[model samples]
Target: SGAIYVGNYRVVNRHLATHNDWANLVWEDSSRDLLVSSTTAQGCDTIARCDCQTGVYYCSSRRKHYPVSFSKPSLIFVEASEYYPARYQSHLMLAVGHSEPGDCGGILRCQHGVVGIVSTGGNGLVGFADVRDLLWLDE
Candidate 1:
């Protein structure tokens, strides 16, 4: 229920997530600037610096950072005619992954605390319950 100001944006806990104890969370706006934040493995809030021009996100929590790029940017919205109910349009999803080889690629879910990485070509599926108006932001 709290918000942190990153650059020119305000973000709350519900708009954050991490994978494998790594704070790989990022929020990219239309301007190409990313508001990156995450909780470190040591349980501390950390901020990341992103350079869209270079396609890199640097985490202050650790020495490591992801040199990633995004493509096929799309705005996800829930429509009333769909199987699920319509809701506010509030998510910018894009395909993000390492620029180097031998690395896994996945989708980056922006906005709404549920930032998840659905691996490419994986058989697993992720679903939500008790949550309404969930929007999909990827193609």
Candidate 2:
């Protein structure tokens, strides 16, 4: 699959994006946004899941640690392509643009909780798999 470096673990995801999601890992341990942009995508078992076309994304800035910023997505299910880096697809994914790049597991959290993970990015857009579709990762 791809290589992702978390706190102290490198997630060698045997499975991930149908496109570039597997081989690419935008985030790493020393990555600046490690704490600000990504989270563990935790508590999905109990926390609410992300629905389509609704809710705001609290994307963290690269420098700021707190005060997650608000942003929006295309609010539609996009077809993933293997040709592009940003269009990297999983079983299901969402498209967004927020002037920031998501790390290996870039997170999408609204006022609710974690809703998505950054799979890849390109051309003014970022492809992030919906957390609900990624529930299997919790295992």
Candidate 3:
């Protein structure tokens, strides 16, 4: 387990879920809150108190970079995917058409704002976990 320094944060897979196709890399950076404000797409009226993704840094295996966008999110419900002894059914997470090597721990942002983190993918469909439920629920 290697670590990477992003701005003032040091993130190393202190994640929430790694079930079947999603996971969240946890870190705190209120300094750039406005810069990468957390936003919602379901119009659920959530709050945070954030990513203008110049690049998504998947700095786990190697410090490889990829130009990605939260572009959008998708709903997932894999009964095989379990988190904390619970199933991750009907969850809203982000998906991408493209992916890179060792990029399963980077940030995933959209036009809304910061959303989730890189998890697992297939054929080219990259999936990430929604942090609000995990983050806000905990906050």
- Which model scores highest in lDDT? 3
Error (Å) of candidate 2 at residue 61 is 7.5
Question: Per-residue lDDT for 16 in model 3?
Answer: 30
- Please give the CA lDDT of all the candidate structures: 0.28, 0.38, 0.39
Give me the displacement of residue 3 in model 3, in angstroms. 9.5
- Candidate 3, residues 1-139: lDDT per residue as tens digits? 2222233333323333223212223433211111122222222323221423332434344455455544333445433323223334223344455654355556554445445556545565555544433343323
- C-alpha TM-scores of all predictions: 0.25, 0.39, 0.39
Candidates ranked by lDDT, best first?
A: 3, 2, 1
Across 30-137, the per-residue lDDT of candidate 1 in tens digits comes to 221123343332322223222122233322223344444443333444334322255432333333432221121222222232232221111221111101121212
Residue 124 deviation, candidate 3, in Å? 1.0
Pairs with steric clashes in candidate 1: 14-113, 15-113
